[PDB]
Scaffold this active site. Structure first.
Site, PDB file in Angstrom:
ATOM      1  CG  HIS B  94      -2.004   1.077   1.093  1.00 41.13           C
ATOM      2  ND1 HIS B  94      -1.865   2.379   1.522  1.00 41.13           N
ATOM      3  CD2 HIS B  94      -3.233   0.994   0.525  1.00 41.13           C
ATOM      4  CE1 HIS B  94      -2.965   3.056   1.225  1.00 41.13           C
ATOM      5  NE2 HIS B  94      -3.809   2.236   0.629  1.00 41.13           N
ATOM      6  CD  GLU B 166      -2.752   2.669  -2.792  1.00 42.20           C
ATOM      7  OE1 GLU B 166      -2.740   3.676  -2.050  1.00 42.20           O
ATOM      8  OE2 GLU B 166      -1.876   1.772  -2.768  1.00 42.20           O
TER       9      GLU B 166
END
EC number: 5.3.1.1
Lengths: 249, 243
Positions: B94, B166
């Site tokens: 992430h 992302e």
């Protein structure tokens, strides 16, 4: 005649549900008939199970790390989440986090200050590496580390702080401190506290030995005058952690 | 007629026992009439609670991070610990971890490889910053990131891999589609057309109950990795948008 001893288990990044249950059962069945605070610092995953099963009146549960506040911090656990979960003890600044996970003196200090403000009992870790103990500057390193922490605390805050001294320089080179060396490091720390925070705080402060302690070597380490118990790594995963507790008699 | 979509809730570092229980109760009571894998990525601390309470047959639980092995790594949780705990899904790489917590392309790749070897379904995150995009290097950055991951993997491993795109910096459906198409094209070219066809690429920008339907409509969007909205009842609308 010292402040109340602490025997803290740092399970680090270890344990299955079964192996940890057996350990907990052992702890639960153990008679401790002297005044000590025992602490079990489990992984974030195992906190629920440890809360549920650990019932010994002399034991509290701790987290091994945290960040200050909830938010966009994927993978991390914050102090409010631990508090909501009923966890009121925390180990902060472990040498592994300082080495692997970017925790400078200041980052550790900030975490400690946030944890105290939030109501935690904090085991704050400090200690010199071999590079530093060689340049003739053990004192410089550990006192700089504790000064960073102190910078962000009030005098009243020290009641909720516990210092763990980690001789990182010894870590996994097979070589271990003499009790005299451990005593000297602890005495240096306390003297700094007495001098900058106050003689009152310094007399009451627990300084735990955080080098490699085992069931055989714990008693003579505890005998030293400025040693107030232990932050235990590997042996805390073993039945001999019970002998380490008994060594704080 | 995409692969099975995924609607994944990234709770990040959030939640109380109360607020998360309320949410889980909502999810449990929800009727979902299509084939979708729903995923709840909670903090390590809330994994036990989520395991017990969450019962929807279309939901699985995930961790938001791990390290490869048990050992002297105070504060961290390893893959064997999660596996012992019955957690079979994981979010890795992430942007916040890449940004704050030292996760380089290679470190992410190693974690992903270790999680696959260990038997995990893995949501592996890639994405460019604002500066990277504005200078025109979206393609270089995200393809370098996935190349690092692919370097540590074998063909058969891609069955247990999900890509979350992302963009670290609201993306039009068109801008999201372009990034997803670029990723799939690279995968087709490097791993095989069969694998790229089956691969889920999840949109992990800022998704809400309101913008999710038109984002899912795009050819190469296979669901979502949801941040803020996943802590809210509207996550149910985001799931429904993968129809």
């Amino acid at each position: 005649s010292k402040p109340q001893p602490i025997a803290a288990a740092n399970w680090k990044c270890n344990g299955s549900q079964q192996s940890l249950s057996e350990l907990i059962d052992l702890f639960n069945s153990t008679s401790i008939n002297h005044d000590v605070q025992c602490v079990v610092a489990s992984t974030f995953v195992h906190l629920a199970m440890t809360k549920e099963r650990l019932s010994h009146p002399k034991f509290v549960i701790a987290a091994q790390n945290a960040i200050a506040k909830s938010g966009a911090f994927t993978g991390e656990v914050s102090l409010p989440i631990l508090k909501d979960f009923g966890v009121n003890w925390i180990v902060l600044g472990h040498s592994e986090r300082r080495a692997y996970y970017g925790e400078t003196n200041e980052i550790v200090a900030d975490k400690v200050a946030a944890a105290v403000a939030s109501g935690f009992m904090v085991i704050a870790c400090i200690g010199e590496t071999l590079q530093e103990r060689e340049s003739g500057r053990t004192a410089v390193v550990v006192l700089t580390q504790i000064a960073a922490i102190a910078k962000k605390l009030k005098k009243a805050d020290w009641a909720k702080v516990v210092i763990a001294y980690e001789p990182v320089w010894a870590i996994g080179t097979g070589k271990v401190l003499t009790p005299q060396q451990a005593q000297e490091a602890h005495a240096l720390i306390r003297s700094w506290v007495s001098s900058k925070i106050g003689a009152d705080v310094a007399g009451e402060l627990r300084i735990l030995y955080g080098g490699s302690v085992n069931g055989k070597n714990a008693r003579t380490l505890y005998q030293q005058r400025d040693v107030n118990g232990f932050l235990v790594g590997g042996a805390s995963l073993k039945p001999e952690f019970v002998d380490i507790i008994k060594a704080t008699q």
